[PDB]
């Protein structure tokens, strides 16, 4: 609802196409921070809603090291960037499980401690 | 120190390269472009014409913006024609 507020102002002025859009600030970014998730949505189900706008190559769900349950945020890289422009913009503020999730562009830095979780995820997304 | 700097640079590069979208990197332009699995049934229309991933459930999920961009897209494209045609004297 922070970002959703921008695009309405932006569009209203007829900004139209990325050169003048704030989405142009990125261009080298693909991963999207996916916030305010419900707790029971897992990687496969976050890999349901987000293929509407593109083809995901990677995904990471943030979850506590001990109990292994959702922190409530994920990082999902689309194959073709412009999906990011599309997902952030179009799907932000949308309800799943009662709570309206947040998306925004992100620069994502991998962490050693999950290293195996990368191949374990990749191998499934490497199937396609 | 120099070696350290070099290492840092390398890591930065790695970070950036990992982050970059795949189609741009091969790029040079603009059933998958990179052979990734693609959907089957007809999808909703889109600004960029991108096709949903094979794994899509098939429900509309949208705030409703993507359709409102077309309304503005059509508008702006229409008033370029209306401006001359409604001109009079």
């Amino acid at each position: 609802n922070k970002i959703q507020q921008i695009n309405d102002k932006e569009l209203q002025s007829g900004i139209l196409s990325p050169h003048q859009s704030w989405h142009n600030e990125y261009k080298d970014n693909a991963y999207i921070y996916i916030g305010n998730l419900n707790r029971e949505l897992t990687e496969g189900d976050i890999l349901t809603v987000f293929s509407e706008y593109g083809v995901p190559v990677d995904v990471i769900l943030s979850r506590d090291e001990n109990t292994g349950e959702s922190q409530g945020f994920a990082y999902l890289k689309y194959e073709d960037q412009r999906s990011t422009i599309l997902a952030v913009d179009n799907l932000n503020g949308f309800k799943i499980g009662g709570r309206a999730l947040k998306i925004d562009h992100t620069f994502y830095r991998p962490k050693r401690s999950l290293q195996k979780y990368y191949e374990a995820v990749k191998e499934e997304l490497d199937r396609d | 120190s120099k070696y350290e700097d070099e290492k840092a640079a390398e890591r930065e590069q790695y970070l950036k390269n990992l982050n970059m979208g795949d189609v741009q990197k091969l790029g040079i332009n603009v059933t998958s472009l990179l052979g990734r699995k693609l959907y089957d049934k007809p999808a909703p229309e889109n600004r960029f014409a991108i096709m949903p991933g094979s794994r899509w459930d098939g429900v509309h999920r949208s705030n409703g913006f993507e359709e409102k961009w077309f309304a503005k897209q059509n508008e702006i494209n229409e008033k370029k024609v209306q401006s001359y045609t409604l001109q009079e004297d």
């Binding site: 419900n38 029971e40 897992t42 090291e65 799943i96 374990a120 | -």
Partner: peptide, 22 residues
């Protein structure tokens, strides 16, 4: 050698996504 990592992904449907449609 016991487990790769204690965490690991799922790739399993939750009842929430299917439920909302029906």
């Amino acid at each position: 050698k016991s487990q790769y990592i204690d965490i690991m992904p799922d790739f399993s449907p939750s009842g929430l996504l299917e439920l909302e449609s029906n």
